[PDB]
Amino acid sequence: NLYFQHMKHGRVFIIKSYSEDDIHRSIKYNIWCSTEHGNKRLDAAYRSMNGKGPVYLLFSVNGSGHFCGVAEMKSAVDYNTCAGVWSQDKWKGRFDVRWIFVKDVPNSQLRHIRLENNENKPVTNSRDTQEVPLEKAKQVLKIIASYKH
Numbered sequence: 607n608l609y610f611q612h613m614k615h616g617r618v619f620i621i622k623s624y625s626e627d628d629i630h631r632s633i634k635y636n637i638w639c640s641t642e643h644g645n646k647r648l649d650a651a652y653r654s655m656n657g658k659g660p661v662y663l664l665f666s667v668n669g670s671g672h673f674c675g676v677a678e679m680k681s682a683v684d685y686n687t688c689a690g691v692w693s694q695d696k697w698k699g700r701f702d703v704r705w706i707f708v709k710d711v712p713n714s715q716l717r718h719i720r721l722e723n724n725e726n727k728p729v730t731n732s733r734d735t736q737e738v739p740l741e742k743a744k745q746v747l748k749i750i751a752s753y754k755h
């Protein structure tokens with residue numbers, strides 16, 4: 607499997623959700639919204655990528671012990687949208703996503719991948735919109751895709 611070799615235009619972020627309901631809504635309607643500073647990071651990455659490669663999102667519910675799937679950013683952030691569509695009313699705005707994997711991957715499968723841009727911490731100890739260096743992101747995606755147990 608060498609699909610990901612020679613991929614240079616791609617950026618990958620961790621998405622954390624306190625709410626399982628928000629995960630289910632995102633899957634159903636292919637939309638997401640982050641914090642203000644999270645939206646700004648994702649919007650900048652999406653817009654500067656300019657359709658040259660994907661912005662992937664690695665989703666995990668806080669405290670759950672596993673990742674729950676992978677989606678791709680499919681639009682810029684619209685900051686002025688209906689309020690209160692998520693579990694909490696904190697989030698302002700909306701962007702499109704396309705879910706790629708919906709599958710539980712235990713943190714045990716991924717905790718040995720460490721992020722040089724986050725103090726060598728395990729990728730499983732990231733906060734919302736932590737960016738993942740491309741070479742580590744490829745390793746995470748291969749583990750998520752190949753997981754079956």
Ligand SMILES: CNc1ncnc2c1ncn2C1CC1
Pocket residue numbers: 622623624625628638639640641668692697734
């Ligand atoms: C609809 N978006 C969201 N829903 C629930 N929690 C969120 C979130 N975006 C960031 N967080 C927290 C850091 C976990």
Ligand SMILES: [Cl-]
Pocket residue numbers: 687688691700
């Ligand atoms: Cl809306």
Ligand SMILES: [Cl-]
Pocket residue numbers: 622668732733734
């Ligand atoms: Cl977080």
